[PDB]
Amino acid sequence: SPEALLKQKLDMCSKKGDVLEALRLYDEARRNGVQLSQYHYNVLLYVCSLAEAATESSPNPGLSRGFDIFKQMIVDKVVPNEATFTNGARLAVAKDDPEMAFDMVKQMKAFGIQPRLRSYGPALFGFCRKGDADKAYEVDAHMVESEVVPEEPELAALLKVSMDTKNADKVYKTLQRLRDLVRQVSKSTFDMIEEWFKSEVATKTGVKKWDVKKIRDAVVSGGGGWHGQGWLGTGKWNVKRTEMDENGVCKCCKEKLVCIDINPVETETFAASLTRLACEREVKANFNQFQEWLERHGPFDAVIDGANMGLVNQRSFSFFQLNNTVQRCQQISPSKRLPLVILHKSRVATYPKNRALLEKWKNAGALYATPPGSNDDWYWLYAAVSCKCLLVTNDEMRDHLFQLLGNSFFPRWKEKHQVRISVTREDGLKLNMPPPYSIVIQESEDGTWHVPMSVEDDLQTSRQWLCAKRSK
Numbered sequence: 001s002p003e004a005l006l007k008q009k010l011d012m013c014s015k016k017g018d019v020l021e022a023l024r025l026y027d028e029a030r031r032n033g034v035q036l037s038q039y040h041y042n043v044l045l046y047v048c049s050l051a052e053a054a055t056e057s058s059p060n061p062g063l064s065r066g067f068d069i070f071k072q073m074i075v076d077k078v079v080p081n082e083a084t085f086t087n088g089a090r091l092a093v094a095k096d097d098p099e100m101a102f103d104m105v106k107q108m109k110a111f112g113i114q115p116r117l118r119s120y121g122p123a124l125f126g127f128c129r130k131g132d133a134d135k136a137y138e139v140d141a142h143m144v145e146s147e148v149v150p151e152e153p154e155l156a157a158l159l160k161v162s163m164d165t166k167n168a169d170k171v172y173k174t175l176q177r178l179r180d181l182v183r184q185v186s187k188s189t190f191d192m193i194e195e196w197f198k199s200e201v202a203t204k205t206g207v208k209k210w211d212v213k214k215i216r217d218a219v220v221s222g223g224g225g226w227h228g229q230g231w232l233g234t235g236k237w238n239v240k241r242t243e244m245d246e247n248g249v250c251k252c253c254k255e256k257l258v259c260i261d262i263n264p265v266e267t268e269t270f271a272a273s274l275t276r277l278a279c280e281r282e283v284k285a286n287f288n289q290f291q292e293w294l295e296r297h298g299p300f301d302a303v304i305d306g307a308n309m310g311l312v313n314q315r316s317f318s319f320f321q322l323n324n325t326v327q328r329c330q331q332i333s334p335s336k337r338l339p340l341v342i343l344h345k346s347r348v349a350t351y352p353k354n355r356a357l358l359e360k361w362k363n364a365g366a367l368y369a370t371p372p373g374s375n376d377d378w379y380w381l382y383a384a385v386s387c388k389c390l391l392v393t394n395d396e397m398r399d400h401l402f403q404l405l406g407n408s409f410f411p412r413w414k415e416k417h418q419v420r421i422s423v424t425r426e427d428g429l430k431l432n433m434p435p436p437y438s439i440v441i442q443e444s445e446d447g448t449w450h451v452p453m454s455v456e457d458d459l460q461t462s463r464q465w466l467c468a469k470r471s472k
């Protein structure tokens with residue numbers, strides 16, 4: 001077959017980085033009357049993106065033709081897949097022309113194709129590198145219209161370009177978008193934000209007089225932790241790196257951070273999504289069986305990730321650590337409920353009295369053994385969300401299948417529900433409870449800002465905060 005033969009030769013081309021040969025095969029196919037599929041185009045976009053950007057001559061046919069191939073792909077109305085968008089962006093990155101990168105996205109739009117976040121990157125980051133705020137903001141508005149949500153790198157570059165063009169209104173807006181969408185910021189974004197607050201433009205932006213009750217209403221209206229009404233105060237900002245104590249009080253300024261509620265409707269939506277995701281990956285009957293078991297049991301104040309409690313910081317499964325955690329969860333339950341222990345069925349172990357206790361917990365309605373081949377992470381997560389209770393796990397809950405859960409609701413839910421164990425020589429096991437405040441960028445009623453850094457493990461490393469408060 002002609003298509004089959006092209007594919008083979010393009011795959012060979014892609015294996016060898018043979019861009020000149022891929023371009024000749026592209027032309028030969030046009031001369032032979034062979035129609036290019038989605039697959040064919042995707043290999044060419046990738047192959048073309050291996051071509052260098054020329055400093056010392058006019059652009060090379062590799063990059064130059066890649067863009068013509070992209071435009072021809074879209075005119076054909078070949079249905080894109082995830083490799084299309086990826087390769088399209090690789091080509092855009094290779095070229096380093098934000099305007100042409102932006103052109104590709106405008107083309108997609110014109111032919112009813114939904115662009116991906118990574119399609120916009122080359123445009124945004126390019127325009128941001130060149131200091132062209134106006135075009136960066138055009139790219140941003142375009143993402144917004146296309147309902148593609150930015151992540152931190154995009155928000156950070158917008159922040160940086162706003163700082164570069166002295167655009168204090170845009171700095172403020174991006175800061176709110178970081179609050180809303182990212183919550184805690186990377187080291188590089190943290191440093192950027194500290195620079196902003198120490199800068200002359202920041203010193204010279206503000207108001208001495210404002211409507212105290214209009215701030216009041218916006219605070220109530222936003223959900224708490226911010227007002228969104230603009231920069232307040234005047235003069236130099238006092239900007240310190242600092243920490244919050246255990247009650248959410250800033251050690252620099254003594255402001256008590258707020259605790260922000262989760263709307264129970266978001267929680268219901270999330271619970272549905274969670275069921276939907278689990279059924280796609282689990283054997284439906286296995287997850288349904290747990291749902292039906294759960295409906296018949298409880299109530300629960302805590303759900304334990306048994307495997308994690310057995311294995312965190314251990315060279316092998318520690319029944320002691322599991323059992324000690326169960327006892328401690330029961331001790332903090334106001335009515336002394338046993339926690340729901342989720343374990344794989346291969347455990348339920350080697351010592352007779354431990355086996356008897358596992359069986360006793362099962363007989364008490366407080367243990368569920370997840371079936372052969374299941375991923376027990378779905379089970380403990382669905383249980384804690386459904387029961388609206390504490391979740392006891394040291395699992396980081398970021399990598400692999402937890403990415404499916406998203407980055408708005410789930411992190412907020414985690415913060416309010418997750419209990420982590422820590423162990424010291426002197427004291428043994430401790431339960432580290434949800435904090436009595438929200439770890440998020442916060443803007444107070446008087447215009448004071450507290451900005452938290454993101455960390456791998458906030459029990460391992462004490463979390464750094466920025467405290468930005470007007471000196472008058």
Ligand SMILES: *C1=CC(=O)c2cccc(O)c2C1=O
Pocket residue numbers: 259260415416417434435436437438
């Ligand atoms: C926010 C505020 C608060 O006082 C509190 C107390 C106990 C447990 C929590 O999760 C919270 C909270 O999230």
Ligand SMILES: [Cl-]
Pocket residue numbers: none
């Ligand atoms: Cl109760």
Ligand SMILES: [Cl-]
Pocket residue numbers: 353
């Ligand atoms: Cl005993």
Ligand SMILES: [Mn+2]
Pocket residue numbers: 305307308376377395
């Ligand atoms: Mn696990």
Ligand SMILES: [Zn+2]
Pocket residue numbers: 250251252253254255450467468469
């Ligand atoms: Zn403070």
